[PDB]
Amino acid sequence: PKGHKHELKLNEKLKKREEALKKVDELIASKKGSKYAKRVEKMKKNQSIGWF
Amino acid sequence: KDYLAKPNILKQLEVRESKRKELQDKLSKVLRDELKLDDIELATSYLIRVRASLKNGYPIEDARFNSRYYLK
Amino acid sequence: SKNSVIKLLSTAASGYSRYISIKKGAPLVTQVRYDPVVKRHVLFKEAKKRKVAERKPLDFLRTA
Amino acid sequence: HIWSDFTTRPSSLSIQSSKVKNYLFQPSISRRSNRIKYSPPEHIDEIFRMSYDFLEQRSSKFYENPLKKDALLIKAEINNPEVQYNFQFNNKLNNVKDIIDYDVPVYRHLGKQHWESYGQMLLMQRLETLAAIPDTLPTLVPRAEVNIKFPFSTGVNKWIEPGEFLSSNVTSMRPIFKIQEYELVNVEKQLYTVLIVNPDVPDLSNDSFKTALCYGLVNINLTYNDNLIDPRKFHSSNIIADYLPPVPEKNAGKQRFVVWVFRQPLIQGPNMLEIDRKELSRDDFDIRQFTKKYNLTAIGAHIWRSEWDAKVAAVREKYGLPPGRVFSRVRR
RNA sequence: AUUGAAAAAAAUAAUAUAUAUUAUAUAUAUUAAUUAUAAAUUGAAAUAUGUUUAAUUGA
RNA sequence: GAAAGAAUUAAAUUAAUAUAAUGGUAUAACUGUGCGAUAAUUGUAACACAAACGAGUGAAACAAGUACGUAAGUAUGGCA
RNA sequence: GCCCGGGAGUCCGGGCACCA
Ligand SMILES: [Mg+2]
Ligand SMILES: [Mg+2]
Ligand SMILES: [Mg+2]
C-alpha cells in the first residue's frame, strides 16, 4: 500500500514540531523583552530541588 | 508537574546517595589509617552527619550533639 | 470596515491557530497563549501578511 | 565621660574590635584598592566628637522600681555610637554574648524595635491570612519572637519563614525553638510552655475538622541570651505530648501547623504545674479550653504548613502509625 | 596584590565561588553600579612628547 | 506643656466611571503608580437564575499551562 | 478581500471575486 498523504508526511511533521519546541522559549523571550529573559536566566541558575 | 520532574528528582537523589556512600568510604579509610576501634558503619554515618552539620552553619560541638541526637 | 479579522498561527508548528480581530491600522500583533497540542504557552504570530499603519521609531539616542 | 568607663556598665556596651573603635574616635572596607578609592565627607571628625560629647553628657545626666530604672538605662544608652554599631552590624538571631547582650536593656530594646519593624509584622500577616489566630486561639499580642528550626532530620540549617511549606522529610523529627523574649520580665521565676497545634485534621463524624496537639512542652526555663529549646534543656519531665510529625492524608488540604508559646502564671522560686499528662486528650484538643484551665497568656507564635507527598507514608511507617487514609479529589 | 593614608573576623542584602537536602539552604570572599546607551572639522578638558622663559618648578 | 507620628470622627457623591439611562462604587469599581502585556489562555463544566423551543445569564469544582504578588491569593477581558 | 488607472504613503475612480 502507498500510504495516505497525511500518513507519509507524519514523521517530518513531528520533526518540525520538535524543532519548533527546541526554539520556542527563545522566541517568547524575544517577544517579551530583555528583562524577562534575564529573569528566566536567573530562575534557571537558581539551583533549587523540589519534592514529590 | 510532579510527574514531569519526578524522574530528574529521583536521579538527583541517587547521585546524592552515591556521593554520601563515597564520603562514608573515605571516612572509613581515614579511620583505618588513624587506627581507631569500631558499629563501624554507624560510626561512619555519624561522622558524615557531623560533616554535614559543619558544612551548614553550626558550632562544631553543637553539630556533633545534634548528629548524636538524630541517631538516638 | 474598521475592524478586520486575522489568523494567528502557533510558533510551535503544531498547526493550532487562533483568530482575533484588530483595527486596520493595528501594529503587527503577536501574543503568547496556550497551545493544547504542545500543552504549554507559545508565541502566536500573524500568518497572512498585511500592511501596517507605520509609526515613527521613537529615538532613545538623542539624535541631532 | 561615662561611656568611656566600664566599672558598673557591662563590657558589651563597647565595640569589641579595637581598630574600629580607634577609627570611630579619630576602617572596615577590607580591600586596599577600595580603601584608597574611598573618600569620606569633610569635617566629620570634629563635629562627630562634639556630638559624642553632647550625647555623653546627656547620658551622664540621665544616669542615676525596676521597670522604670530599666527604661531610664535604655534612654541613657541608646545614643551611644558604639552600642548602635554593635547592634546594627552584628547578627541578632544567633546572638553572641559579648557583642550583643540581651541581659543589657538597651540591646533588648533595639532588638524589639527591629522585630517590630519587620519580622513581627510578617508573622502577624501570616497568622491573619492563613487564619491561624481566630481558628485556634482568639488573638495574640506579639511580645516575643519565636523562630523554629528542623535540624535533626536532613541535617541542614535554616530558620523557617512563617507560613512556609515544609516537606515531610524536613518535619519528620522534632523542631527547635528560640523564644527571644523582651519587655523586662523575670528570668529565674518565669516558666514557659510551647504547643504545636494543627487545627485542620479531617473529622468525618461532624464532617468538619478537629485540632490535634502534635507537640507539647511545659515549664521551660528561659534566659535572655540562652533561649534555644534543644533536648539538652527541657528533659522528659517537661514533655506533655511528645512530638508527632505532620502526616497529612492525601487530598486533605494544606494542614497548618501553628506553634504557640505561652508564659506561666507567676505567684519564691520557679513555680511549676502538673498537667495530668495521661488524661489530656491530644488527638482532639481544645487550645482555648486548655489556656482557660491553666491561665496561660500566649506571648508569641510561629506557623508552617504541610501537604501530602510520596514521603509521608515512609514517615508514618517510621513512626509506627496507620497507613493513612486517602480522600476524594473533589470537594463534594 | 602592587600605589595612598599612618594577625583577622563576627548584621541585612547584593554579587563571585563552592557544597548540603526528594528543604530556592549554608560556608568563604568583596561591598560594584544608581540615569548611562551609536554618529560631531570650529567648543572645552586631560595626558604623553618637544621648544622657550622666570637639575627642578611654574608659565 | 510642646513637636512629630499613627490616626479616628464628621462630611463623603454626584466629581469620576470608554459610551444612553438606571442601580451601584471612598472598604472605592474612581484616580495615581511598579511590575506586567499575562486570565481579551486550553480540556471537562455540576448546579442554579431565566426560559415554550431555539437561545441567554451567573457559576462552584476537576485537570493543563501563564501573569502579578513577601505571602494570603487574585486574574477564563471591561462596575453591572 | 485581490487586480488596475489616476520604492513608500496618503486621497480619489474602475473592475475582479463574496453574494449563503
Ligand atoms: Mg450613577
Ligand atoms: Mg477595572
Ligand atoms: Mg432552556
XYZ file of C-alpha atoms (C1' of nucleotides) and ligand atoms in Angstrom:
682
model
C 0.000 0.000 0.000
C 1.139 3.509 -0.894
C 0.057 5.160 2.376
C -2.136 8.240 2.835
C -0.555 11.657 2.193
C -1.080 12.666 5.837
C 0.404 9.316 6.961
C 3.646 9.668 4.952
C 4.181 13.327 5.914
C 3.852 12.434 9.616
C 7.446 11.836 10.688
C 8.582 15.057 9.027
C 5.782 16.966 10.760
C 6.820 15.503 14.108
C 10.429 16.508 13.472
C 9.334 20.043 12.608
C 7.289 20.235 15.806
C 10.278 19.059 17.833
C 12.465 21.704 16.205
C 9.887 24.381 16.997
C 9.759 23.238 20.619
C 13.548 23.415 20.830
C 13.345 27.043 19.599
C 10.165 28.454 21.248
C 11.271 29.751 24.649
C 13.842 31.981 22.957
C 11.170 33.345 20.621
C 8.890 34.050 23.575
C 11.709 35.877 25.355
C 12.369 37.965 22.253
C 8.685 38.855 22.025
C 8.647 39.869 25.686
C 11.858 41.815 26.241
C 15.293 41.554 27.826
C 14.171 41.866 31.446
C 12.012 38.756 31.095
C 14.925 36.862 29.559
C 17.180 37.935 32.421
C 14.592 36.766 34.946
C 14.340 33.407 33.187
C 18.123 33.050 33.252
C 18.169 33.838 36.970
C 15.475 31.232 37.594
C 17.470 28.652 35.642
C 20.573 29.457 37.679
C 18.644 29.274 40.985
C 19.591 25.662 41.805
C 16.673 24.509 43.967
C 15.480 20.910 44.118
C 11.764 20.434 44.775
C 9.953 17.401 46.137
C 7.215 14.987 45.071
C 4.487 18.988 37.002
C 5.487 16.427 39.619
C 5.253 13.643 37.047
C 7.436 15.619 34.647
C 10.100 16.469 37.201
C 9.963 13.263 39.219
C 12.480 11.212 37.237
C 15.019 14.033 37.352
C 14.500 14.398 41.097
C 14.985 10.659 41.571
C 18.204 10.784 39.561
C 19.456 13.676 41.683
C 18.638 11.759 44.860
C 20.513 8.719 43.566
C 23.533 10.882 42.769
C 23.438 12.365 46.265
C 23.257 8.894 47.794
C 26.251 7.791 45.735
C 28.202 10.838 46.894
C 27.308 10.094 50.514
C 28.453 6.499 50.115
C 31.752 7.690 48.663
C 32.208 10.088 51.577
C 31.471 7.302 54.054
C 34.052 5.083 52.373
C 36.622 7.875 52.559
C 35.872 8.390 56.249
C 36.280 4.668 56.904
C 39.627 4.693 55.110
C 40.759 7.671 57.184
C 39.727 5.892 60.381
C 41.673 2.803 59.331
C 44.738 4.937 58.625
C 44.434 6.562 62.047
C 43.999 3.209 63.815
C 40.848 3.665 65.925
C 38.466 0.959 67.203
C 34.953 0.335 65.827
C 29.296 -0.493 64.615
C 31.864 0.810 62.130
C 29.087 1.641 59.671
C 27.195 3.509 62.386
C 30.327 5.459 63.287
C 30.860 6.385 59.642
C 27.259 7.565 59.373
C 27.687 9.692 62.490
C 30.863 11.218 61.072
C 29.095 12.039 57.814
C 26.254 13.685 59.730
C 28.749 15.756 61.710
C 30.478 16.824 58.499
C 27.144 17.854 57.001
C 26.337 19.887 60.105
C 29.726 21.597 59.917
C 29.136 22.435 56.258
C 25.900 24.091 57.333
C 26.060 26.863 59.966
C 26.710 25.072 63.265
C 29.228 25.326 66.125
C 31.094 22.049 65.949
C 30.266 20.557 69.345
C 26.616 21.527 68.925
C 26.559 19.954 65.464
C 28.035 16.745 66.858
C 25.412 16.679 69.602
C 22.651 17.168 67.042
C 24.026 14.316 64.950
C 24.130 12.062 68.005
C 20.562 13.006 68.885
C 19.332 12.167 65.388
C 20.776 8.665 65.699
C 19.292 8.298 69.176
C -14.976 48.328 7.891
C -12.627 49.380 10.702
C -12.072 46.002 12.280
C -10.617 43.153 10.253
C -10.066 39.564 11.364
C -6.660 37.881 11.374
C -5.331 34.375 11.900
C -2.602 33.796 14.461
C -0.546 30.667 13.990
C 1.376 28.886 16.743
C 5.146 29.450 16.514
C 5.468 25.882 17.670
C 4.459 24.177 14.415
C 1.547 22.135 15.777
C -0.729 23.951 13.324
C -3.020 25.129 16.103
C -4.232 28.579 15.152
C -6.351 31.126 16.947
C -8.207 34.083 15.484
C -8.647 37.662 16.659
C -9.993 40.962 15.374
C -7.951 44.165 15.086
C -8.173 47.670 13.660
C -6.861 48.145 10.123
C -4.020 50.368 11.358
C -3.099 47.958 14.184
C 0.590 47.062 14.707
C 1.910 43.626 13.774
C 0.319 41.546 16.540
C 1.840 38.707 18.446
C 0.556 37.121 21.631
C 1.712 34.248 23.773
C -1.103 31.821 24.524
C -1.679 28.189 25.405
C -1.211 25.643 22.633
C -3.151 22.412 23.532
C -1.092 20.296 21.163
C 2.253 21.213 22.667
C 0.453 21.737 26.058
C 2.418 24.869 27.017
C 2.372 28.559 26.215
C 3.875 29.651 22.927
C 4.061 32.726 20.797
C 1.285 33.089 18.201
C 2.180 35.136 15.095
C 0.201 36.570 12.161
C 0.051 34.067 9.293
C -1.044 36.245 6.363
C 0.983 39.392 5.647
C -0.787 42.767 5.917
C 0.210 46.436 5.613
C 0.622 48.341 8.876
C -0.029 51.996 9.705
C 3.638 52.939 10.037
C 4.733 54.610 13.279
C 7.990 56.546 13.546
C 10.665 54.688 15.544
C 10.945 56.774 18.736
C 14.545 57.882 19.340
C 16.206 56.983 22.644
C 19.690 58.010 21.466
C 19.258 61.823 21.455
C 19.696 62.408 17.709
C 20.827 65.695 16.093
C 32.921 60.677 80.258
C 30.507 57.917 81.288
C 30.705 55.793 78.110
C 34.490 55.515 78.498
C 34.045 53.997 81.994
C 33.385 50.237 82.378
C 33.112 49.586 86.127
C 29.367 49.033 86.607
C 28.402 49.273 82.923
C 28.739 45.863 81.194
C 31.614 45.315 78.741
C 29.197 44.717 75.843
C 28.426 48.446 75.502
C 31.838 48.910 73.819
C 32.942 47.841 70.367
C 34.989 44.684 70.925
C 37.087 45.227 67.786
C 39.771 47.774 68.670
C 40.617 49.022 65.180
C 37.013 50.005 64.518
C 36.856 51.836 67.844
C 40.057 53.700 67.006
C 38.650 54.693 63.620
C 35.461 55.946 65.255
C 37.321 58.012 67.828
C 39.657 59.594 65.273
C 38.174 51.473 58.603
C 36.489 48.133 57.750
C 36.247 48.184 53.977
C 38.796 45.364 53.664
C 40.436 45.740 50.252
C 43.356 48.181 49.913
C 42.442 49.494 46.468
C 38.862 50.053 47.618
C 40.116 51.886 50.712
C 42.294 54.104 48.518
C 39.316 54.862 46.287
C 37.119 55.756 49.281
C 36.774 59.433 50.229
C 34.871 60.338 53.413
C 32.973 63.626 53.867
C 34.848 66.663 55.192
C 34.750 67.995 58.762
C 33.250 64.706 60.017
C 35.837 64.375 62.793
C 35.466 67.480 64.968
C 31.695 67.655 64.537
C 31.390 63.954 65.381
C 33.487 64.464 68.511
C 31.268 67.365 69.557
C 28.167 65.239 69.019
C 29.674 62.437 71.102
C 30.457 64.884 73.897
C 26.892 66.185 73.823
C 25.308 62.759 73.860
C 27.744 61.512 76.517
C 26.773 64.473 78.703
C 23.098 63.679 78.181
C 23.709 60.051 79.132
C 25.545 61.132 82.280
C 22.649 63.404 83.218
C 20.202 60.542 82.696
C 22.302 58.246 84.865
C 21.032 57.921 88.429
C 11.360 50.482 90.991
C 12.828 48.116 88.361
C 10.999 48.636 85.059
C 11.332 52.417 85.315
C 15.039 52.064 86.086
C 15.483 49.787 83.077
C 13.700 52.305 80.862
C 15.946 55.085 82.149
C 19.026 52.972 81.442
C 17.811 52.320 77.907
C 17.228 56.031 77.363
C 20.717 56.830 78.642
C 22.388 54.285 76.423
C 20.635 54.210 73.019
C 22.530 57.191 71.522
C 25.967 55.653 72.240
C 27.551 55.171 68.835
C 29.359 52.021 69.938
C 26.176 50.253 71.011
C 24.482 51.241 67.749
C 27.425 49.850 65.780
C 27.253 46.603 67.731
C 23.561 46.155 67.231
C 23.215 47.195 63.605
C 26.195 45.318 62.189
C 26.169 42.044 64.141
C 23.665 39.193 63.991
C 20.695 39.325 66.382
C 19.371 35.796 65.753
C 22.350 33.627 66.748
C 23.416 36.165 69.314
C 26.938 36.343 70.794
C 27.026 37.338 74.481
C 29.805 39.958 74.468
C 28.821 41.694 71.187
C 25.103 41.940 71.994
C 23.872 41.063 75.497
C 20.091 40.777 75.760
C 20.774 40.901 79.510
C 21.595 44.542 78.779
C 18.367 46.512 78.398
C 19.349 48.837 75.555
C 20.229 45.944 73.269
C 16.966 44.205 74.161
C 15.029 47.363 73.318
C 16.838 47.650 69.991
C 16.034 44.020 69.195
C 12.373 44.607 70.000
C 12.329 47.650 67.730
C 13.920 45.637 64.927
C 11.326 42.898 65.352
C 8.524 45.462 65.229
C 9.968 46.894 62.026
C 9.644 43.625 60.042
C 9.635 40.066 61.358
C 6.802 40.587 63.832
C 4.686 42.214 61.133
C 5.400 39.326 58.775
C 4.382 36.834 61.449
C 1.158 38.728 62.093
C 0.360 38.756 58.386
C 0.946 35.021 58.144
C -1.305 34.401 61.142
C -4.103 36.563 59.759
C -4.065 35.447 56.144
C -3.759 31.745 56.914
C -6.474 32.021 59.577
C -4.264 30.782 62.393
C -5.469 33.140 65.131
C -9.290 33.140 65.002
C -9.254 29.424 64.131
C -7.036 28.176 67.024
C -6.516 30.960 69.573
C -8.620 34.167 69.622
C -5.785 36.700 69.268
C -2.239 37.422 70.381
C -0.150 40.459 71.271
C 3.376 39.727 69.861
C 5.624 40.286 72.936
C 8.404 37.804 71.990
C 9.756 36.364 68.716
C 9.656 32.623 68.164
C 11.912 31.124 65.499
C 11.688 27.411 64.737
C 14.178 25.090 63.052
C 14.286 21.429 61.979
C 17.951 20.465 62.474
C 17.793 16.717 63.124
C 16.085 15.356 60.018
C 18.049 16.030 56.809
C 20.782 17.908 58.702
C 20.618 21.350 57.084
C 20.439 24.696 58.866
C 17.516 27.048 58.250
C 15.248 29.297 60.264
C 11.744 28.651 58.950
C 9.960 31.650 57.450
C 6.417 31.883 58.834
C 3.798 30.168 56.666
C 6.157 28.005 54.628
C 5.627 24.627 53.038
C 7.903 22.020 54.584
C 8.499 18.594 53.089
C 7.521 15.566 55.172
C 11.232 14.688 55.257
C 12.081 18.052 56.862
C 9.385 17.874 59.524
C 9.971 14.150 60.198
C 11.779 14.766 63.506
C 11.070 17.427 66.131
C 11.874 21.143 65.876
C 13.974 23.589 67.870
C 12.501 26.880 69.097
C 14.181 30.140 70.020
C 11.842 32.289 72.096
C 13.516 35.704 72.071
C 11.872 37.487 74.997
C 11.878 41.258 75.564
C 9.906 43.508 77.968
C 11.893 43.457 81.262
C 10.444 40.143 82.538
C 11.752 37.997 85.421
C 14.153 35.222 84.361
C 14.558 32.933 87.398
C 10.880 32.514 88.343
C 9.228 32.801 84.879
C 8.442 29.494 83.150
C 7.087 28.874 79.638
C 5.011 26.380 77.634
C 5.120 25.597 73.931
C 2.349 23.897 71.926
C 2.468 22.814 68.279
C -1.158 22.524 67.218
C -2.744 21.691 63.884
C -6.422 22.594 63.690
C -7.236 21.067 60.289
C -7.373 17.318 60.536
C -10.482 15.772 58.956
C -13.368 14.975 61.302
C -15.623 12.556 59.410
C -18.337 12.365 62.095
C -19.100 16.101 62.109
C -17.741 16.474 58.544
C -15.689 19.457 59.825
C -12.150 19.464 61.265
C -10.620 18.747 64.690
C -7.454 20.167 66.280
C -4.559 17.872 67.195
C -1.754 18.772 69.612
C 1.301 17.320 67.904
C 3.971 18.545 70.375
C 3.765 19.985 73.895
C 6.408 21.340 76.283
C 5.647 22.839 79.691
C 7.630 24.538 82.450
C 10.597 25.565 80.343
C 13.180 27.915 81.833
C 14.396 30.691 79.509
C 17.145 33.313 79.581
C 17.579 36.483 77.509
C 20.801 35.209 75.880
C 20.201 31.452 76.304
C 16.830 30.584 74.733
C 17.339 27.689 72.291
C 14.951 24.860 73.246
C 17.109 21.835 72.420
C 16.754 18.341 74.008
C 19.695 19.465 76.191
C 17.449 21.846 78.118
C 13.889 20.609 78.626
C 14.182 16.936 79.793
C 11.481 14.246 79.508
C 9.553 15.554 82.544
C 8.601 18.719 80.602
C 7.006 16.983 77.589
C 3.219 16.654 77.932
C 2.714 15.377 74.387
C 5.831 14.040 72.658
C 6.494 15.069 69.059
C 4.316 13.619 66.319
C 5.179 14.667 62.784
C 2.923 16.203 60.151
C 1.419 13.312 58.196
C -1.263 14.896 56.004
C -3.696 12.497 54.341
C -3.923 12.732 50.537
C -6.330 15.470 49.373
C -6.925 16.732 52.916
C -5.924 20.304 52.038
C -2.849 22.041 53.402
C -2.593 21.393 57.141
C -1.475 24.437 59.132
C 0.919 23.660 61.986
C 0.927 26.636 64.324
C 3.388 26.738 67.217
C 2.138 28.738 70.191
C 4.307 29.930 73.067
C 2.790 30.842 76.440
C 4.262 32.161 79.675
C 3.260 30.680 83.055
C 1.201 32.463 85.713
C 3.504 33.973 88.355
C 2.678 33.759 92.090
C 9.565 32.331 95.757
C 11.346 30.018 93.300
C 10.229 28.704 89.889
C 6.509 27.854 90.064
C 5.765 24.567 88.268
C 2.438 22.986 87.333
C 1.247 19.421 86.840
C -0.908 18.872 83.741
C -2.291 15.298 84.014
C -0.046 14.134 81.132
C -2.111 10.948 80.645
C -5.625 12.433 80.905
C -5.064 15.253 78.380
C -6.623 14.265 75.033
C -4.072 15.071 72.299
C -5.825 13.505 69.279
C -8.613 16.105 69.656
C -7.557 19.109 71.695
C -9.107 22.413 72.772
C -6.421 25.115 72.957
C -8.643 27.857 74.361
C -10.053 25.497 76.986
C -6.541 24.443 77.982
C -5.497 28.079 78.316
C -8.528 28.810 80.485
C -7.700 25.842 82.705
C -4.075 26.796 83.384
C -4.416 30.572 82.924
C -1.742 30.948 80.227
C -1.028 34.143 78.263
C 0.141 33.428 74.708
C 3.208 35.596 74.155
C 4.451 34.534 70.735
C 3.719 32.273 67.813
C 5.082 30.833 64.611
C 3.498 28.772 61.851
C 4.229 26.469 58.943
C 2.054 24.229 56.778
C 2.323 20.710 55.414
C 0.820 18.900 52.450
C 0.703 15.262 51.379
C 3.597 13.843 49.389
C 5.168 10.490 48.466
C 7.437 10.690 51.520
C 4.680 10.767 54.175
C 3.946 7.034 54.061
C 7.575 6.299 54.917
C 7.435 8.785 57.793
C 4.273 7.136 59.101
C 5.935 3.724 58.918
C 8.952 5.044 60.811
C 6.685 6.472 63.500
C 4.593 3.278 63.523
C 1.281 4.849 62.572
C -1.631 3.623 60.442
C -1.136 3.517 56.632
C -3.059 6.803 56.245
C -6.448 7.453 54.653
C -6.991 8.779 51.143
C -9.684 11.316 50.248
C -11.545 12.070 47.022
C -10.026 14.846 44.914
C -13.413 16.609 44.717
C -14.722 18.969 47.390
C -18.141 17.332 47.106
C 48.012 42.077 45.293
C 51.462 46.345 43.722
C 50.347 52.855 44.645
C 47.755 56.394 49.229
C 46.937 57.214 54.447
C 49.863 56.477 59.408
C 47.425 38.527 62.809
C 41.952 38.913 61.450
C 36.680 38.214 61.675
C 31.539 38.355 63.937
C 24.338 42.229 60.570
C 20.731 42.647 56.450
C 21.071 42.421 51.299
C 23.583 42.183 46.671
C 27.460 39.891 43.645
C 31.621 35.822 42.909
C 32.937 30.796 44.229
C 31.922 26.159 46.463
C 28.894 22.437 48.647
C 24.433 20.470 51.650
C 18.933 18.274 51.309
C 13.312 14.473 47.370
C 14.420 21.998 52.169
C 15.446 28.368 46.489
C 19.718 26.443 52.167
C 24.731 27.148 54.099
C 30.195 28.324 54.012
C 34.079 31.793 52.307
C 35.290 36.477 49.918
C 34.079 41.521 48.305
C 30.686 45.533 49.115
C 30.378 47.116 42.357
C 26.742 50.079 39.630
C 22.255 54.175 40.964
C 20.469 57.679 34.748
C 24.020 55.612 31.076
C 23.407 53.900 25.592
C 25.890 54.827 18.159
C 27.092 59.085 14.778
C 30.127 65.779 15.765
C 36.417 69.648 11.457
C 35.415 75.399 14.650
C 33.582 74.101 21.607
C 36.134 72.578 26.220
C 39.405 69.238 29.047
C 43.199 65.958 30.282
C 47.644 63.156 29.476
C 52.256 61.906 26.682
C 56.270 64.239 23.699
C 59.104 68.810 22.006
C 60.885 74.377 22.157
C 61.276 78.859 25.095
C 61.381 81.647 29.681
C 61.400 83.288 35.099
C 68.595 69.880 37.725
C 63.695 71.259 39.142
C 59.177 74.095 39.482
C 55.604 77.286 37.425
C 54.268 79.739 32.800
C 3.385 71.988 78.206
C 5.218 71.414 73.041
C 6.823 68.617 68.233
C 6.130 64.539 65.207
C 3.560 60.108 64.012
C -0.373 56.952 63.841
C -4.901 58.141 63.090
C -10.078 58.428 64.231
C -14.693 61.124 63.641
C -17.650 64.167 60.573
C -18.680 65.242 55.671
C -18.350 61.784 51.954
C -21.493 61.756 45.978
C -22.704 63.382 42.141
C -16.822 64.697 40.784
C -15.179 60.231 38.284
C -16.953 55.514 35.673
C -14.783 54.120 27.351
C -20.446 55.286 25.818
C -27.660 56.476 26.975
C -30.486 55.762 31.424
C -30.843 53.240 35.954
C -28.722 50.697 40.034
C -24.059 50.651 42.282
C -18.991 52.477 43.900
C -14.342 56.028 49.136
C -13.959 49.227 52.209
C -13.785 52.592 46.234
C -15.251 49.604 40.854
C -12.938 56.338 40.857
C -7.774 58.310 40.468
C -2.061 57.674 40.712
C 1.990 54.371 40.401
C 5.574 49.369 39.993
C 5.808 45.052 37.623
C 3.350 43.145 33.536
C 1.434 42.584 28.425
C -0.151 37.997 31.197
C -6.819 35.302 32.530
C -9.169 39.772 25.746
C -5.313 31.028 27.612
C -6.718 25.264 26.950
C -9.967 20.271 28.002
C -14.371 18.818 31.323
C -18.247 22.315 33.398
C -22.053 20.331 38.236
C -25.734 23.393 39.940
C -28.787 27.486 39.818
C -31.462 32.036 37.527
C -34.165 32.661 33.264
C -36.945 30.034 29.981
C -42.314 27.229 25.060
C -38.275 25.507 21.890
C -34.004 27.906 19.608
C -31.370 30.721 22.547
C -29.494 33.780 27.096
C -27.291 34.658 32.284
C -24.222 33.669 36.987
C -21.110 29.955 38.192
C -18.521 26.134 42.248
C -15.192 22.284 41.195
C -11.540 18.922 38.329
C -7.251 18.964 35.120
C -3.056 21.778 31.681
C -0.060 25.939 31.314
C 0.775 31.837 32.352
C 0.971 36.712 34.824
C 1.456 39.791 39.242
C 2.054 39.238 44.345
C 6.732 38.626 50.652
C 2.501 35.981 51.341
C -2.831 35.320 51.516
C -4.290 34.984 46.965
C -6.147 37.384 42.507
C -6.961 37.160 37.184
C -11.362 32.473 31.911
C -11.441 40.674 29.189
C -14.056 45.766 30.520
C -18.586 48.179 37.927
C -23.214 45.966 36.078
C -10.596 40.651 0.498
C -7.438 40.566 -4.836
C -6.259 43.101 -9.610
C -5.718 48.206 -12.306
C -5.822 53.738 -13.592
C -5.128 58.498 -11.667
C 10.415 52.468 -3.642
C 6.812 54.177 0.067
C 2.489 56.883 1.922
C -1.892 59.249 1.584
C -6.504 60.833 -1.409
C -9.831 59.640 -5.491
C -12.191 56.484 -9.679
C -12.559 51.382 -12.313
C -13.033 46.272 -12.167
C -12.419 41.139 -10.101
C -14.209 37.603 -6.528
C -18.350 37.218 -1.716
C -23.281 37.493 -2.787
C -25.266 31.697 1.984
Mg -24.645 56.807 38.963
Mg -11.498 47.572 36.345
Mg -33.729 26.168 28.188
